[PDB]
Symmetry: C4
Subunit: 30 residues, 4 copies
């Protein structure tokens, strides 16, 4: 159902933002 699909798309976007949070790792190079 479209609501469930939307909700999962949002959860994926939110995880990608937290991953891009974890990647400031890049401390090692600057």
């Amino acid at each position: 159902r479209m609501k469930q699909i939307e909700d999962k798309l949002e959860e994926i976007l939110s995880k990608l933002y937290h991953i891009e949070x974890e990647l400031x790792i890049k401390x090692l190079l600057g």
Copy 2:
């Protein structure tokens, strides 16, 4: 087809959770 989209999005979310598993790399700091 709609359930196939939802299942692929669950697989994508689960792989992102495993990546976000791997990234605690950030131990180093």
Copy 3:
């Protein structure tokens, strides 16, 4: 709604490409 799903999937793919940008980190090795 269907185009909104396709647009969000493009944003997801673009953010993954930026992550896969960040991960060349792998310079270290």
Copy 4:
């Protein structure tokens, strides 16, 4: 259209596999 959505889902899954390629980075810890 459903084909275009499917194709993008596959491209995302393929990028996630390459990222999880780049993360064997985890050389630093083992």
